[PDB]
Amino acid sequence: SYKKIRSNVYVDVKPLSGYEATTCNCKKPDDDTRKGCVDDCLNRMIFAECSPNTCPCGEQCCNQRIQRHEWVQCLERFRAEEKGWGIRTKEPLKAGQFIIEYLGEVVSEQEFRNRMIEQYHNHSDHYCLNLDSGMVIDSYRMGNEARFINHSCDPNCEMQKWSVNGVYRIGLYALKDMPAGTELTYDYNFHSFNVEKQQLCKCGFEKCRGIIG
Ligand SMILES: C[S@@+](CC[C@H](N)C(=O)[O-])C[C@H]1O[C@@H](n2cnc3c(N)ncnc32)[C@H](O)[C@@H]1O
Ligand SMILES: [Zn+2]
Ligand SMILES: [Zn+2]
Ligand SMILES: [Zn+2]
């Protein structure tokens, strides 16, 4: 029962990273076929996508994934046993691959708290990641499919914080290759917000830490 958005909705804050990542220097290819910014390009080293208007690789680069909204067209929602809904791929996924950007209403730490008691009173799930400087990305009412990814103590994905054109945004990247049909997951510990609301983890894992978060 959420509203589908294609981009973050900035409520009362601004996640300005404060660092103008420019001149990624990594050289441009030669074949339209292949890509431009290998596993290098000085920018990707400080998790800062390249500003289109300067990247040596022109329109055919690969470190602007979050900007160009280059999400994977495979994710499929589905009923996860004792975890309600969940997301999974229909196409395999090499590791380190950009999977999708995590959207929502980016709000302050206090703006969220209020929502946490003023509206998310009688609520079961927890939809929001830590963004930066207390600012949070709330997705209880708005966001995309990522809001549907479950937690695992042995994640196959990691949420990463990148400076995009001067604004911190969060993308979901794979940690390990995955066979089609595999459910995407990430560790809510260093990413998801902090509310003493707790739940038993149906992670289904050997050394599972027992509790979410
Ligand atoms: C943002 S939602 C993920 C989508 C959700 N499964 C649904 O049906 O709408 C987060 C909630 O899903 C459930 N969940 C996600 N991962 C879980 C896990 N490993 N174990 C148990 N519950 C999980 C918990 O209620 C948690 O608060
Ligand atoms: Zn570069
Ligand atoms: Zn670039
Ligand atoms: Zn677990």
From Swiss-Prot:
Subcellular location: Nucleus; Cell junction, Tight junction; Chromosome
Domain (Post-SET) ranges: 197-213
UniProt function note: Histone methyltransferase specifically trimethylating 'Lys-36' of histone H3 forming H3K36me3. Also monomethylates 'Lys-9' of histone H3 (H3K9me1) in vitro. The physiological significance of the H3K9me1 activity is unclear.
Region (Catalytic domain): 2-213
Effect of V13I: In MRD52; uncertain significance
Family statement: Belongs to the class V-like SAM-binding methyltransferase superfamily. Histone-lysine methyltransferase family. SET2 subfamily.
Clinical note on disease: Intellectual developmental disorder, autosomal dominant 52: A disorder characterized by significantly below average general intellectual functioning associated with impairments in adaptive behavior and manifested during the developmental period.
Name the record gives this protein: Histone-lysine N-methyltransferase ASH1L
Organism of derivation: Homo sapiens (Human)
Tissues showing expression: Widely expressed, with highest level in brain, heart and kidney.
Every AWS domain range: 19-70
Domain SET: 73-189
